[model samples]
Target: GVQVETISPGDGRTFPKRGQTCVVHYTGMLEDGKKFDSSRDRNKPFKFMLGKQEVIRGWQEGVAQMSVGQRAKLTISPDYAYGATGHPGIIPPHATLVFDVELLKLE
Candidate 1:
């Protein structure tokens, strides 16, 4: 299961539905607090089809629970993440990931 902690509760009128596109900004880090990636660094938000396999399973699950303009933290376990065979070079085996994600918009 994925863990989602709201940092700034967004305008919660509605959450993004499946198939809708989600625009977001985020920082990806290891459980030990090491930074790995960030959309903010590129000065652009990342876009992906909600519920689609365009990103990691943890992202799909966590983002689906977000509303526009919301900021939150997500802690994903290995089962919902890279698991035993983590991303080569970037992540290690059985590593947990922490992400600070903000929902920018739904397109």
Candidate 2:
């Protein structure tokens, strides 16, 4: 369970709906604040169809909750994140994940 927080104000428009392509730049980490992955390092934002389950549950819900030009910190519980089995190396079992998310644009 989580509520979306807008870290940086957006235009108050362009909130993504399900099936729309969304562009995001983010840092993924654990509760202790160690970075597991980042789109920044890749030098490109990750783009995917929001609400498509193409990414993790945390990412799917978190990105869809965002508006273009918005930034937010998303705290995802296990069920909303990696799931019960968890990501073996990147995350632990029953882990809660956090993401520094920037919504770059929508298509």
Candidate 3:
């Protein structure tokens, strides 16, 4: 499972629904306090279709509950993340990933 903490509340009244696309900026880190990846560093927002399972399980649940302009911290277990194998050259085995996520837009 994943943990979601709202760092700041959103503006709009509606949260994003499954099948809709969401644009976000995020920085991903490891439990050891080393950053793994970041959309901000790329200078682009990451976009994904909610509930499509195209992204990580943690994000499916985390972003689904967010509204535009919301900023949250997502702590995802390996079960909901890259799992035992993890992502090569980036994540280690059974790592707990952390993400500072900001929902920028919905479409």
Candidate 4:
């Protein structure tokens, strides 16, 4: 597996392992840096299970490298992200996605 390093290290925490649930606050943007979504703005956290198909490929891979309380900025290529058939409203076709994510908790 590829190794990723965090710049600020968020809260210096490690994310959840596979099969565990992770709660995070995140903001998603396009490659051009236009923001599309933000959990923090909604005052809520996003929850998902590690290695689960509930999210896109890049999200599954990127978040796997995080630890609880860790924050990371993920730049994902379309091939590893939404691919050719991107979401209509939020993502254009062949668009790359950027995510600034905070791993809040794991269980």
For every candidate, C-alpha RMSD to the true structure in Å:
0.8, 1.2, 1.2, 2.4
Best first by TM-score, ranked? 1, 3, 2, 4
Q: Candidate 1 vs candidate 4: which has greater lDDT? A: 1
Q: Report the C-alpha lDDT of model 1 over 1-100, residue by residue, as the tens digit.
A: 6899999998998699889999999999999998899999999889999777768899889999888888999999988889999998999999899999
- Evaluated at residue 92, the lDDT of candidate 1 is 95
For all candidates in order, the CA lDDT equals: 0.91, 0.83, 0.89, 0.79
Q: Write the per-residue lDDT of candidate 2 for residues 1-107, one digit (tens) a residue.
A: 44467789766787888888888899988989998999998989998897675587777787777788989988888888767798797789988888889989888
**Tens digits of per-residue lDDT for model 4 on 25-94?**
9988997888899998999999988887778778778888887768788878888777889898889998
What's the number of clashes in each of the models?
0, 0, 0, 5
How many Å off is the CA of 36 in candidate 3? 1.1
All candidates in order of lDDT, best leading: 1, 3, 2, 4
After superposing candidate 2 on the true structure, give the runs of residues whose Cα lies further than 4 Å from its correct spot: none
* Residue pairs with backbone atoms closer than 3 Å in model 4 (clashes): 14-67, 14-68, 15-66, 15-67, 15-68
Per-residue lDDT of model 3, residues 24-47, tens digit only: 999999998788789999999999
Backbone clashes, candidate 2? 0
Give the lDDT of residue 47 in candidate 2: 89
Q: How do all models score by TM-score? A: 0.96, 0.91, 0.93, 0.86
Error of 4 at 41 (Å): 1.3
Which number leads on lDDT?
1
**TM-score (C-alpha, index-matched) for candidate 1:** 0.96
Clashes in model 1: which pairs? Answer: none
* Among all candidates shown, the one with the greatest TM-score: 1
